[PDB]
């Protein structure tokens, strides 16, 4: 039951009590994925318009 690193100030205080010792994707790659999904949406819409044109 040891209390360490007690720091006191006007608005409060803090400390630590120990009970027992122990025993990214780049901007280009993000733009590629955003554009790949947009292209899949365009391809699906083109297929729909082709279906409706028939």
């Amino acid at each position: 039951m040891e209390v360490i690193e007690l720091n006191k100030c006007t608005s409060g205080q803090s400390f630590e009590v120990i009970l027992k010792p122990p025993s990214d994707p780049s901007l280009e790659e993000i733009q590629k994925k955003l554009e790949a999904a947009e292209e899949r949406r365009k391809y699906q819409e083109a297929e729909l318009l082709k279906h409706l044109a028939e």
Partner: protein
């Protein structure tokens, strides 16, 4: 500002559509001349979803009236709220469609569809952000069925990223005008399978049974049937017309209710159905709302399983008691709800009740039992088609028998798709 464009096509679509606008105009305080005379700002908070605001604080329905005969639309223009509709939004021909899907879809209707699209385009251009479209029509006739589904196809071509919603009246031999209704309905169902996101299946068989059995109307008329449709249409659009959190727009409703794109045909229900001053408790509203006798599709829900359910309670009531009764129906009949869609029952509450009721409940079910409706239509179709009976009405309009064979196969596939998820 999430606007909806309303379209009503054919005799049934315009008569049911006019009653719908008559009902919700009263709920929003709009009078037959478009002037607001309400007493609550809740009436106007979402008023622009269905109404345009014109000069002089006038509210004009965003409604387009379509028919191949002038007759029924003259009755609308002479009806109670006939003056509220935009006069340029009356789009009609003179020939009629003779209850012939081919005339509405391929010959007579093709001549008129472009002028309807001009009115749709004019309404869409004045929308801050168009949600999508709702169409009222029957499937058993020629104009609402044949030309209505032609309209849906051409609206999808011009607005591919918008939601298409229909109130579709299914024919029944009990309430029948001609013997070719199964032909027209089978041809239309495949169109709806492909080109709508949400379809409320309104079965004239159920409407008749409710009027006769429950409401004790020995001789139901179309007006009696349309009273049930008015109440149902007002109930299923409450979440779109009033402030709320659940299914507040058409796309969020489709995301919650449609787990597979083709299975988007809903069983609507309404409570109460009284033949009248007695107050209805929350347990009674909840029990009636799930009873088969309150369903508008004439399908036994116990013959199938619920994929998704939406429930809308209207009026001043204990929302805690609503949650208790809603959880009670699910926990006491959980064998009728699919277990692979957790929490597939959503409940909404609106404070403003319908006219003449302290409280009400509206049921929207995506049940696999709806296959009984399509099976019924499929059997009547086949009984005639196996002998090619009455086909000359259609081949005379340029159609080939193969298109009927494919429509037949398409609807039997739809039946089989419901059956694979019922097991």
């Amino acid at each position: 500002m999430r606007e909806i464009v309303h379209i009503q096509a054919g005799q049934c679509g315009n008569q049911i559509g006019a009653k719908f606008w008559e009902v919700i105009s009263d709920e929003h305080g709009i009078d037959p001349t478009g002037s607001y005379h309400g007493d609550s700002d809740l009436q106007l908070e979402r008023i622009n979803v269905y109404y345009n605001e014109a000069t002089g604080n006038k509210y004009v329905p965003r409604a387009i009236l379509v028919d191949l005969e002038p007759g029924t639309m003259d009755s609308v223009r002479s009806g109670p709220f006939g003056q509220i509709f935009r006069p340029d939004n009356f789009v009609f021909g003179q020939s009629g469609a003779g209850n012939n899907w081919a005339k509405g879809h391929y010959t007579e209707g093709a001549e008129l569809v472009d002028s309807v699209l001009d009115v749709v385009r004019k309404e869409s251009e004045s929308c801050d952000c168009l949600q999508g479209f709702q169409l009222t029509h029957s499937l058993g006739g020629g104009t609402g069925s044949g030309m209505g589904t032609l309209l849906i196809s051409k609206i999808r071509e011009e607005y591919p990223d918008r939601i298409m919603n229909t109130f579709s009246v299914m024919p029944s031999p009990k309430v029948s005008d001609t013997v070719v209704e199964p032909y027209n309905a089978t041809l239309s169902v495949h169109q709806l399978v492909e080109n709508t996101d949400e379809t409320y299946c309104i079965d004239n068989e159920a409407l008749y049974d409710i009027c006769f059995r429950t409401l004790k109307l020995t001789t139901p008329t179309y007006g009696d049937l349309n009273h049930l449709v008015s109440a149902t249409m007002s109930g299923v659009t409450t979440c779109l017309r009033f402030p709320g959190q659940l299914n507040a727009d058409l796309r969020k409703l489709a995301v919650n209710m449609v787990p597979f794109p083709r299975l988007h045909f809903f069983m609507p229900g309404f409570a109460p159905l009284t033949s009248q001053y007695r107050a209805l408790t929350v347990p009674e509203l909840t029990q009636q709302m799930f009873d088969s006798k309150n369903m508008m599709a004439a399908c036994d829900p116990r013959h199938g399983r619920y994929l998704t359910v939406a429930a809308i309670f209207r009026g001043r009531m204990s929302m805690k008691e609503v949650d208790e009764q809603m959880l009670n129906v699910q926990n006491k009949n959980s064998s009728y709800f699919v277990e692979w869609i957790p929490n597939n029952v959503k409940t909404a509450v609106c404070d403003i009740p319908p006219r003449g009721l302290k409280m009400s409940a509206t049921f929207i079910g995506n049940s696999t039992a709806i296959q009984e409706l399509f099976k019924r239509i499929s059997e009547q179709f086949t009984a005639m088609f196996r002998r090619k009976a009455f086909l000359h009405w259609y081949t005379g309009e340029g159609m080939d028998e193969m298109e009927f064979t494919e429509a037949e196969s398409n609807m039997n596939d739809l039946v089989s798709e419901y059956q694979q998820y019922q097991d």
